[PDB]
């Protein structure tokens, strides 16, 4: 049986693990004197005994008690690892020669994409651009080699651990050879480091070794990106990224920031959190007027030094009696640390250069110093003070908040539903409000009075929204852990850390709890529930079974993440979902007009809301949904509940014969009477309280207001009409408004007990900090590098999956191009990390050893003979470039460097392959395709056309992915290989609603094929509407979620282990997906075709149609076959006698246009809507879970209007999924006015909108005009719809206008795009001749029954009209 | 005339409804649910009154 | 009419002027931590005196008193100020950044 | 008119006394009739739809 | 006309007096005062269910 350990930091650095481990190892309190150190010394853990008993560390401990070696805390060793340089003359040669090779192969791989693009745009290395870059990057700099050298040594110590710990369990790596002078002992359960020359030792969690590896990676990536960028910006001053860093100042900025973590220990991260504070102030100092910048900078230097005082006061507090007592430096006690902090901030200031491009990307500096060991008890001891505290409110300030919430709801219903929400209490109102009710309108905020927001607070409603009477299993299931119920809570602590009367108690309490309650992960909580039924959430919600419930705990775990037993987690997720479905539509913010902006942060914001300040509005929602206590559950239940730090190494001290923890004495890490405000829970509700309260502040201040809230931030922009007194400037008036309104915002937040401190709020004129990103003058100043930092060998995978790793290196290295605006810096940086992930890191995969690399060695040897290439390295240049759909190495197809979405992936996978093959075959991509004296491009297309037809289940596979090819002609996704492994497991789950479904699922997958099989012209997106309508789709989401866990075969056998059954199938998947290119391109005279494909007059979209059809043996496939814009458009720079095409023009004045804004509205490209009429019925009576089922049914009514059997097909669907006869349901369907469901339909499988591969702001520099194309497209195609998307013809234009600048250093004044008309076909909607299999349709609905959306009862239908 | 002095009564008499009703919602707190009182202060609501009709059958 | 109406508009002012001067104190932990304590409605001067004599458990209580009054508190007046003052250690640090 | 305004003054003289009592009490059958009226004024709106059913 | 207004006003002065009758009993603390309200809702459910059993 096998365990596979993490490859990157996920979760947290556990402080109480480092404490528990180090305290036992040395037999004295290590990081802190709190209870984990005492219990770990009394009764050590077996996972740690197996460390301490090693004949190496038993020697180190004997050396420590002899006093020859000195004990240190892991941020000390972070500094020693990072400021380490060692050279053996051969060692520094080797680490240099490896990085010279990685760079050379990344440029020799990137060259074919640049030669494809520069040959298309008509602008061992072929392109002289990369030949100049290769002459430049020929010697790596000594500050980079040092980060790559440390990365290679920490990655090697880790890959030498993980691959050995797969090969045998319980293995502890002991290594003093890999990284010089250091000795590591490394285990899943702990790490030890010793430095001999410095006579010092640290003990730390495994996740901290992952963190030093990921810090060395993060700095390797910053030095790679900014060295690539600095070499690109030495050739053309617009080709590399937006920023312009000097790297020796980055490497010092890193080594100073580790040196403050050496001084301040773990507490030094309090200061590193205020790097955000300093970088915001350097941005503000450039852009804002004096009164705003002077004020921000002063309020920031307060934060940084309050954090350094707090770091010192905490550090000297915790260390007092620990084994660390003598390990805190004189530079702290004498205060000389202010000098160091001044050198660190003076480096941030110098790196930022007073250049706003550096200062937006310099946000990466927040993430590059590692993570605090978060003390899982102190994070509670510092929060109970905010949450046990009594709050005082004026009854007027409560009333005006409840009235502002009700006013936003009356304004909400009157906007959306042309009505007031129905009132039980209308007889409260005065005549000038009864008049607004009876006329079904409202006063606007200027007509509104604060006395009005009192009398509106007195209203009570009648029920308008309705609760779903079934559990939505896809909303309610996710992979993550959950708390045991109260009486089993001690199961979260390792058995040795519990006293005897807990161990021999809990082993008699597990005997009176059901198998669900014991399970402590969300999946297993449902899968083990052998008395589940779909109503049993609703039937507890209206029954109030969460009020004063004896199973309740809140459990806090590693920034604290809070969780509670399944019955309450259901109520939380429903209380949060009903706000999202039904209430967010009312709160979509989720002489001179003097103008202000105020920003506020919502970290504290949950802990402030007591019952009285959020239940008042939540009781408005409890009325409207007709239920007592659903939205107010949080403050009504949690005050009765003990809150426990349940992190594994963090137990409470329990007094003798106490077992029920509503009777365990309060202590560090365990307390009672939390007066509501748990983190993340009710976040959607408190966003409604923020937006409501702001429309009371705006009334009291008599100013216009606009609000934006997302996650942890709110941003507010304010205008007050004011008449200026003499000598006052606009900036002086804007600042007085900002202060008068900040005074009011503080007053009214304190009026709801939410005290505020100026660390969390600041005032600004026009600078904004939405979504962590910086806008000045409406130009985007990107944070690109902050996204890219962790790009490396096994990212975002399960089981180190080669395909998901490649796709996710591609996905992240787009942020240098979509935000960073440099294509060639994306390619070279990506082709470093892909070449590293393929040519280096596959030689030592964790699960497979050489086996994935020996399978690339046969793929490369195969490509060599197929393409007549001269070396296996240039066969790898080709593998690394052709697309993953054909089992190649390249995750980011050459289309998505210009438009972010395509209606068809196959034609782009073929065109990407056409463009790259021009490198070898010396074709020109501007010309029509022709005969040449080598066949290699024709021979590739001949093998794409010519294959043996092996379709299986050819309709249900087109239902579950409308793009798909099958016949073993595509790489197999994790989901399709694993759906059998999941269903064989779920067919053994005690939960009937999963068991009966998974027992029948492999017969429903046959009936769900055979339903549609008869209908003649197959329309895959129309199949997808049928798929999403049928109950099997919600049953498939569950299987597709569970098919993406690690350990699939072991889910409900309670191990973190992975069964070898899954290492076998994952190896089968990876080894087939790699080798696929030898099956797609066979050497066998290409299925005996002694004539290779004639490409004279060839159209690549017609070849793409023929292949997608042949791959299913379907006679016609319709609507998916849309062309590749990038291949149809020829590009020209002056209007010749042709006088035709789509013209894109620079409306900005100057010659460059990156980082500058034009006069035009920005562009996102949006797809002509599925034109329809909504019929008159009471819309709100139907839950989202069935109100979207009615639109899927309505799509089927107009798509499949033409079938032989429309009436029976809609009847057995509507009696199935709606529970209504067809002619009575037809009243509720939108009636679709658009003619052509091929050209205009909406479903998940079809792109909604078509953004350009450019940041949105830059599109404003350009104007687009389709008039010259419309002549030839109208009168070659008879004013009929054509198989193309103009939204990508524009988005290809706007991005080509950016990429042509980057390669030439001028933004060209005009581009003309001229279609190759061969790629454009009539998109005529067909008669869907054939009969639906109505019995097979009933069988799908019956076997599925449990997953159906709720049936419309006549009780609900009469109210609906 | 006297309606005009009486509109000046009603817009104050209804301002009292808002204040006292907010005080009832705010008073119906965690320790009302401890004592199982809460539904007596705020009144029974549609989805539970509906449930009582299914028990009536 | 007016001689009877005089009696009524007076009594609506003697109700409404009390309701605009009521303080709601949240539910909270009881003294010596035995169970929850129930949410309490009092006149402004009676609830200010409860904070004043330390009968209810709260923090920054000088600001809670001064904010329940129609007044401006010193720690709020420090923070909501036009110009914001450097504390002594930040007032040292700034000289190194010049 | 007179008796209407004296009836209003009398109902107000209870409301001042009840409100003063509430402030002092910080340290029933008329309510059970508040809920018994509202819960069946509510219940008739369900029966109205159950008659259209 | 006052003949309408003074019966609107009378019902607001009924609902105010009913709200204060909720608050002044919710303000009481002892086990007997907290019992007599719970058993009245249990009685009110038993009277509501037996009412709807007629219809």
């Amino acid at each position: 049986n096998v365990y596979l350990t993490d490859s990157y930091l996920k979760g947290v650095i556990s402080f109480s693990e480092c404490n528990a481990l180090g305290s036992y190892i040395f037999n004295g309190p290590y990081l802190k004197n709190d209870y984990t150190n005492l219990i770990s010394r009394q009764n050590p853990l077996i996972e740690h005994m197996n460390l301490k008993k090693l004949n190496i560390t038993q020697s180190l401990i004997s050396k420590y008690h002899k006093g020859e070696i000195k004990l240190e805390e892991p941020t000390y060793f972070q500094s020693l690892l990072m400021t380490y340089k060692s050279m053996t003359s051969s060692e520094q040669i080797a680490t240099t020669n490896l990085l010279k090779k990685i760079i050379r192969r990344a440029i020799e791989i990137s060259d074919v994409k640049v030669y494809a693009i520069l040959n298309k745009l008509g602008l061992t290395i072929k392109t002289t651009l990369l030949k100049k870059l290769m002459c430049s990057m020929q010697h790596p700099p000594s500050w980079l080699i040092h980060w790559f050298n440390l990365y290679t040594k920490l990655n090697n110590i880790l890959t030498q651990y993980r691959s050995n710990e797969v090969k045998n369990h319980g293995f502890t790596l002991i290594d003093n050879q890999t990284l010089s002078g250091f000795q590591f002992i490394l285990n899943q359960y702990g790490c030890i480091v010793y430095h001999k020359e410095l006579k010092r030792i640290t003990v730390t969690t495994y996740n901290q070794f992952l963190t030093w590896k990921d810090i060395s990676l993060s700095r390797l990536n910053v030095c790679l990106i900014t060295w690539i960028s600095n070499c690109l910006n030495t050739l053309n001053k617009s080709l590399g990224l937006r920023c312009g860093f000097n790297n020796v100042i980055l490497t010092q900025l890193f080594l100073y920031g580790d040196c403050i973590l050496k001084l301040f220990h773990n507490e030094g991260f309090y200061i590193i959190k205020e790097v955000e504070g300093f970088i915001m102030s350097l941005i503000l100092n450039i852009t804002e007027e004096d009164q705003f910048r002077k004020r921000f900078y002063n309020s920031m230097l307060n934060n940084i030094t309050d954090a350094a005082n707090k770091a010192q006061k905490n550090l000297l507090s915790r260390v007092c009696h620990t084994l660390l007592d003598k390990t805190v430096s004189d530079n702290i006690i004498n205060g000389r640390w202010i000098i160091l902090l001044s050198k660190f901030l003076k480096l941030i200031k110098l790196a930022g250069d007073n250049n706003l491009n550096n200062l937006s990307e310099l946000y990466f500096l927040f993430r590059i110093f590692g993570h605090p060991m978060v003390d899982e008890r102190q994070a509670m001891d510092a929060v109970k003070i905010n949450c046990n505290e009594t709050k005082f409110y004026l009854l007027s300030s409560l009333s005006m908040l409840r009235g502002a919430f009700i006013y936003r709801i009356i304004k909400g219903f009157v906007n959306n539903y042309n009505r007031w929400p129905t009132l039980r209490n209308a007889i409260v109102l005065p005549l000038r409000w009864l008049t607004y009710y009876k006329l079904n309108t409202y006063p606007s905020l200027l007509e509104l009075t604060e006395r009005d927001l009192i009398v509106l607070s007195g209203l009570r409603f009648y029920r308008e929204f309705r609760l779903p009477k079934k559990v939505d299993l896809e909303m309610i299931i996710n992979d993550k852990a959950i708390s045991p119920p109260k009486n089993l809570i001690w199961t979260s602590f390792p058995r040795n850390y519990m006293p005897s009367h807990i161990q021999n108690y809990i082993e008699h309490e597990k005997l009176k709890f059901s198998e669900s309650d014991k399970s402590r992960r969300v999946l297993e909580y449902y899968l083990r529930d052998n008395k589940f039924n779909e109503c049993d959430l609703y039937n507890c919600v209206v029954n109030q079974s969460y009020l004063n419930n004896p199973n309740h705990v809140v459990s806090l775990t590693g920034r604290m993440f809070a969780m509670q037993p399944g019955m309450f987690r259901q109520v939380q997720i429903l209380a949060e979902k009903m706000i999202a479905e039904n209430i967010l539509q009312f709160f979509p913010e989720s002489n001179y007009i003097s103008k202000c902006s105020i920003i506020t942060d919502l970290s504290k914001f949950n802990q402030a809301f007591r019952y009285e300040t959020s239940c008042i509005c939540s009781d408005v929602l409890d009325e409207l949904h007709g239920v007592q206590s659903l939205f107010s559950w949080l403050h009504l239940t949690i005050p009765h509940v003990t809150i426990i730090c349940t992190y594994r190494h963090a137990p409470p001290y329990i007094g003798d014969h106490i077992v029920d923890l509503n009777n365990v004495d309060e202590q560090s890490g365990l307390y009672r009477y939390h007066m509501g405000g748990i983190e993340g829970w009710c976040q959607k509700l408190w966003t409604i309280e923020a937006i409501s309260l702001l429309d009371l502040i705006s009334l009291k201040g008599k100013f216009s207001i606009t609000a934006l809230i997302n996650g942890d931030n709110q941003s507010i922009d304010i205008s007050k009409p004011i008449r200026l007194m003499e000598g006052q400037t606009h900036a002086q008036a804007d600042y007085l408004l900002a202060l008068n309104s900040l005074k009011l915002l503080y007053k009214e937040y304190a009026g709801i007990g939410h005290k505020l401190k100026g660390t969390e709020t600041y005032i600004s004129r026009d600078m904004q900090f939405m979504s962590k990103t910086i806008q000045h003058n409406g130009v985007y100043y990107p944070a690109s590098i902050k996204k890219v930092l962790r790009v490396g060998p096994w990212i975002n995978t399960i089981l180190d999956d080669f395909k998901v790793s490649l796709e996710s290196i591609g996905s992240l290295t787009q942020e240098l191009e979509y935000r960073g605006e440099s294509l060639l810096c994306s390619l070279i940086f990506r082709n470093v990390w892909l070449y590293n992930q393929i040519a280096l890191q596959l030689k030592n995969h964790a699960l497979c050893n050489n086996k994935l690399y020996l399978d690339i060695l046969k793929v490369l040897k195969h490509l060599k003979t197929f393409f007549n290439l001269d070396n296996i390295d240039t066969a790898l240049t080709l593998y690394m470039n052709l697309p993953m759909l054909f089992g190649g190495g390249d995750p980011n197809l050459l289309y998505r460097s210009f438009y972010r979405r395509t209606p068809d992936f196959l034609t782009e996978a073929i065109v990407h392959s056409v463009f790259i093959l021009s490198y070898y075959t010396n074709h020109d991509l501007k010309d029509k395709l022709q005969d040449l004296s080598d066949d290699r491009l024709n021979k590739f297309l001949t093998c794409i056309i010519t294959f043996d037809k092996n379709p299986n289940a050819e309709f249900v596979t087109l239902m579950r992915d409308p793009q798909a090819l099958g016949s073993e002609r595509q790489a197999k996704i994790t989901s399709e290989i694993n759906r059998l492994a999941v269903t064989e497991v779920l067919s053994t789950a005690p939960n009937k609603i999963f068991s009966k479904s998974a027992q029948h699922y492999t017969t429903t997958e046959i009936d769900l094929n055979d339903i549609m099989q008869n209908i003649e012209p197959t329309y895959p997106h129309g199949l997808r509407v049928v798929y999403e309508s049928l109950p099997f789709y919600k049953a498939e989401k569950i299987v597709n979620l569970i098919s993406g866990t690690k350990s699939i075969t072991n889910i409900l056998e309670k191990t973190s282990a992975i069964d070898l059954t899954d290492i076998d199938r994952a190896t089968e998947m990876m080894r087939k997906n790699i080798t696929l290119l030898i099956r797609i391109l066979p050497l066998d005279c290409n299925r005996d075709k002694r004539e290779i494909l004639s490409m004279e007059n060839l159209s690549i979209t017609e070849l793409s149609k023929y292949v997608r059809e042949r791959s299913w043996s379907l006679s016609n496939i319709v609507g998916v076959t849309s062309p590749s814009i990038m291949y149809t458009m020829d590009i020209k720079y002056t209007t010749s006698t042709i006088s035709s095409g789509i013209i894109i023009e620079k409306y900005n004045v100057n010659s460059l246009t990156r980082g500058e804004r034009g006069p035009t509205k920005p562009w996102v490209g949006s797809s002509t809507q599925e034109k329809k009429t909504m019929p008159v019925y009471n819309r709100q009576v139907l839950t989202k879970k069935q109100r979207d089922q009615i639109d899927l049914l309505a799509k089927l009514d107009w798509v499949y209007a033409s079938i032989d059997n429309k009436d029976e097909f809609m009847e057995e669907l509507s009696i199935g999924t709606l529970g209504l006869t067809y002619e009575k349901a037809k009243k509720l369907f939108p009636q679709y006015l658009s003619v052509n469901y091929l050209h205009r339909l909406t479903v998940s499988s079809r792109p909604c909108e078509f953004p350009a591969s450019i940041p949105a702001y830059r599109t404003t520099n350009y104007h687009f005009d389709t008039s010259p194309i419309n002549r030839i497209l109208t009168e070659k195609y008879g004013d009929e719809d054509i198989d193309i998307v103009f939204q990508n013809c524009i988005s290809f234009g706007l991005s080509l206008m950016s990429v042509v600048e980057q390669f030439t250093n001028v933004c060209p004044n005009r581009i003309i795009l001229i279609p190759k008309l061969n790629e454009i076909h009539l998109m005529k909607p067909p008669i869907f001749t054939g009969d639906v299999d109505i019995h097979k349709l009933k069988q799908v609905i019956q076997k599925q029954h449990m997953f159906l959306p709720d049936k419309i009862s006549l009780t609900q239908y009469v109210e609906l009209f | 005339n006297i309606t005009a002095r009486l509109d000046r009564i009603d817009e104050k008499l209804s301002e009292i409804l808002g204040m006292l009703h907010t005080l009832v919602v705010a008073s119906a707190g965690p320790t009302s649910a401890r004592d199982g009182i809460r539904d007596a202060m705020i009144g029974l609501r549609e989805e539970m009154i509906e449930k009582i009709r299914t028990e009536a059958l």
Side-chain angles (χ1 to χ4, degrees), chain A residues 806-903:
Chain A
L806 249 66
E807 288 181 345
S808 196
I809 288 173
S811 187
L812 295 177
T813 60
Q814 285 303 153
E815 304 320 291
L816 304 192
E817 181 175 23
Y818 292 1
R819 294 184 232 233
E821 307 196 76
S822 55
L823 158 64
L824 187 53
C825 186
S826 176
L827 300 183
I828 297 159
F829 180 73
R830 187 194 318 136
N831 294 141
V832 163
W833 286 104
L834 295 180
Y835 171 87
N836 181 44
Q837 207 273 351
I838 277 162
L840 302 173
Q841 294 284 285
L842 281 178
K843 298 168 167 160
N844 50 78
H845 193 288
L847 298 181
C848 300
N849 317 310
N850 290 329
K851 298 189 178 194
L852 266 71
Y853 186 71
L854 291 158
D855 286 357
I856 288 181
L857 286 177
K858 64 198 62 158
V859 171
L860 300 175
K861 291 166 192 180
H862 188 91
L863 286 173
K864 190 188 72 181
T865 175
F866 191 95
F867 292 109
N868 201 261
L869 298 173
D870 63 300
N871 181 14
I872 194 177
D873 304 303
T874 184
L876 185 144
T877 296
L878 175 56
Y879 177 90
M880 289 287 280
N881 270 288
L882 79 89
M884 301 208 79
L885 189 144
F886 303 153
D890 196 297
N892 287 338
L893 287 80
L894 187 51
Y895 92 81
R896 80 177 298 106
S897 272
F898 307 89
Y899 42 98
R900 307 188 200 180
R901 290 183 183 126
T902 176

Side-chain angles (χ1 to χ4, degrees), chain B residues 43-55:
Chain B
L44 296 79
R45 298 184 172 137
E46 293 273 45
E47 307 262 289
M48 194 184 78
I49 290 177
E50 176 171 317
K51 179 175 175 67
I52 286 163
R53 315 205 312 150
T54 69
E55 203 195 329

Side-chain angles (χ1 to χ4, degrees), chain A residues 295 302 388 390-393 396 666 673 735 746 755 758:
Chain A
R295 187 179 200 288
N302 296 159
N388 288 162
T390 66
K391 297 295 189 180
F392 303 87
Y393 313 115
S396 311
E666 305 186 271
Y673 321 111
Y735 173 68
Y746 267 64
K755 298 188 291 181

Side-chain angles (χ1 to χ4, degrees), chain A residues 679-949:
Chain A
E679 172 63 302
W681 305 358
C682 294
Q683 170 161 239
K684 285 186 168 74
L685 171 67
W686 298 314
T687 301
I688 321 308
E689 309 292 25
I691 296 159
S692 176
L693 184 70
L694 286 168
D695 295 5
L696 172 65
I697 283 160
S698 165
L699 180 63
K700 284 188 177 188
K702 64 175 188 179
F703 52 71
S704 182
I705 195 158
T706 68
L708 171 69
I709 313 196
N710 68 301
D712 63 351
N713 275 258
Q714 74 184 9
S715 312
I716 301 150
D717 306 338
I718 300 173
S719 303
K720 186 173 178 181
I722 200 68
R723 188 156 290 250
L724 297 177
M725 66 188 70
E726 72 290 336
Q728 190 172 91
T729 73
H730 299 166
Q732 292 161 6
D734 290 344
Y735 173 68
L736 287 176
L737 167 62
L739 289 170
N740 290 353
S741 62
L742 187 76
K743 174 214 71 172
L744 178 65
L745 182 148
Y746 267 64
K747 176 196 289 193
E748 296 304 306
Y749 275 60
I752 74 146
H754 187 325
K755 298 188 291 181
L756 290 175
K757 294 191 288 191
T759 306
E760 85 202 298
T761 181
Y762 64 100
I763 63 167
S764 174
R765 187 185 69 182
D766 70 67
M767 169 49 66
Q768 295 295 338
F769 295 89
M770 112 283 191
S771 63
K772 312 181 186 178
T773 195
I774 287 58
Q775 298 188 351
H776 162 68
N777 216 110
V779 175
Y780 195 75
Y781 290 97
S784 68
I785 294 189
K786 196 230 67 68
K787 285 287 187 174
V788 177
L789 291 179
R790 274 170 58 167
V791 160
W794 317 105
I795 52 164
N796 307 328
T797 63
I798 62 161
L799 309 180
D800 305 1
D801 189 340
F802 167 77
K803 194 177 186 282
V804 173
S805 174
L806 249 66
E807 288 181 345
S808 196
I809 288 173
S811 187
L812 295 177
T813 60
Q814 285 303 153
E815 304 320 291
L816 304 192
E817 181 175 23
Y818 292 1
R819 294 184 232 233
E821 307 196 76
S822 55
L823 158 64
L824 187 53
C825 186
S826 176
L827 300 183
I828 297 159
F829 180 73
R830 187 194 318 136
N831 294 141
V832 163
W833 286 104
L834 295 180
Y835 171 87
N836 181 44
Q837 207 273 351
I838 277 162
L840 302 173
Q841 294 284 285
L842 281 178
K843 298 168 167 160
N844 50 78
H845 193 288
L847 298 181
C848 300
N849 317 310
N850 290 329
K851 298 189 178 194
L852 266 71
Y853 186 71
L854 291 158
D855 286 357
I856 288 181
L857 286 177
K858 64 198 62 158
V859 171
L860 300 175
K861 291 166 192 180
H862 188 91
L863 286 173
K864 190 188 72 181
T865 175
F866 191 95
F867 292 109
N868 201 261
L869 298 173
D870 63 300
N871 181 14
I872 194 177
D873 304 303
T874 184
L876 185 144
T877 296
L878 175 56
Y879 177 90
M880 289 287 280
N881 270 288
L882 79 89
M884 301 208 79
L885 189 144
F886 303 153
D890 196 297
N892 287 338
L893 287 80
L894 187 51
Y895 92 81
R896 80 177 298 106
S897 272
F898 307 89
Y899 42 98
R900 307 188 200 180
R901 290 183 183 126
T902 176
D904 176 26
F905 297 122
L906 176 60
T907 309
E908 305 296 10
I910 297 176
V911 168
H912 182 193
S913 308
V914 172
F915 280 9
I916 288 159
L917 259 297
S918 76
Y919 184 90
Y920 300 99
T921 59
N922 64 70
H923 290 98
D924 191 329
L925 302 320
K926 66 139 290 272
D927 298 350
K928 190 180 301 182
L929 303 185
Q930 284 168 27
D931 176 48
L932 283 185
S933 198
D934 70 334
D935 59 351
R936 285 180 294 174
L937 177 58
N938 312 72
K939 194 172 69 172
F940 175 88
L941 278 318
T942 299
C943 299
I944 287 297
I945 286 181
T946 320
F947 64 98
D948 52 339
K949 308 185 302 185

Side-chain angles (χ1 to χ4, degrees), chain A residues 273-485:
Chain A
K273 188 167 62 179
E274 305 297 347
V275 167
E276 163 252 299
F278 198 77
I279 291 164
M280 283 181 184
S281 198
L282 295 175
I283 289 161
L284 292 166
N285 282 7
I286 292 164
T287 183
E288 286 281 312
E289 300 291 356
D290 303 308
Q291 301 298 346
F292 290 97
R293 60 170 175 202
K294 289 171 63 73
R295 187 179 200 288
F296 186 95
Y297 181 89
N298 284 23
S299 195
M300 166 282 288
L301 285 183
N302 296 159
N303 297 326
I304 291 179
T305 62
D306 292 326
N309 286 353
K310 189 175 295 292
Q312 164 171 356
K313 190 181 186 183
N314 278 269
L315 171 57
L316 292 172
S317 179
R318 55 167 270 247
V319 164
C320 58
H321 298 100
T322 68
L323 299 178
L324 297 171
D325 54 19
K326 288 186 174 177
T327 71
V328 51
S329 308
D330 279 332
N331 303 53
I332 284 186
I333 288 174
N334 73 15
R336 287 189 76 257
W337 66 258
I338 299 163
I339 305 171
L340 177 65
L341 221 180
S342 88
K343 286 172 178 183
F344 180 52
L345 301 179
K346 190 185 303 180
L347 281 164
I348 296 180
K349 187 177 174 178
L350 187 66
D353 199 43
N354 297 343
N355 175 1
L356 185 57
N357 305 283
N358 290 10
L359 297 166
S360 63
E361 296 190 328
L362 190 56
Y363 276 75
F364 70 71
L365 193 67
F366 189 81
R367 201 69 174 203
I368 201 149
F369 290 113
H371 294 64
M373 298 189 293
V374 57
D375 178 339
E376 309 87 353
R377 307 177 194 252
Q378 179 166 354
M380 283 170 66
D381 296 0
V383 170
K384 73 179 297 295
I385 294 162
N386 287 203
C387 303
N388 288 162
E389 164 188 342
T390 66
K391 297 295 189 180
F392 303 87
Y393 313 115
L394 290 159
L395 186 61
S396 311
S397 66
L398 297 186
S399 301
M400 293 181 188
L401 179 55
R402 191 175 201 267
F405 193 94
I406 285 174
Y407 174 77
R408 286 292 303 236
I409 275 167
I410 289 156
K411 172 168 178 171
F413 270 73
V414 173
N415 277 16
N416 290 274
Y417 304 153
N418 301 312
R419 205 183 62 254
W420 273 51
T422 40
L423 298 179
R424 81 172 70 235
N425 233 32
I427 196 167
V428 169
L429 297 171
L431 280 69
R432 58 158 286 273
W433 271 103
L434 283 162
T435 300
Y436 279 120
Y437 173 48
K438 290 172 65 171
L439 279 60
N440 286 258
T441 56
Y442 55 73
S444 63
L445 291 178
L446 300 316
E447 292 168 299
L448 193 70
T449 327
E450 71 194 336
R451 182 167 67 241
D452 296 311
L453 296 186
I454 303 295
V455 62
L456 281 186
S457 74
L459 294 180
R460 287 178 294 153
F461 310 86
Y462 275 149
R463 161 186 63 177
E464 283 285 13
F465 302 112
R466 289 179 166 270
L467 298 181
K469 293 188 177 182
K470 294 181 64 178
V471 169
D472 183 5
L473 283 161
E474 168 60 356
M475 97 183 177
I476 245 161
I477 282 184
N478 78 284
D479 310 44
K480 212 174 191 293
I482 194 172
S483 185

Side-chain angles (χ1 to χ4, degrees), chain A residues 120-131:
Chain A
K120 175 60 175 181
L121 299 185
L123 290 166
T124 184
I125 297 295
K126 292 191 187 193
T127 188
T128 183
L129 180 66
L130 275 309
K131 204 186 293 178

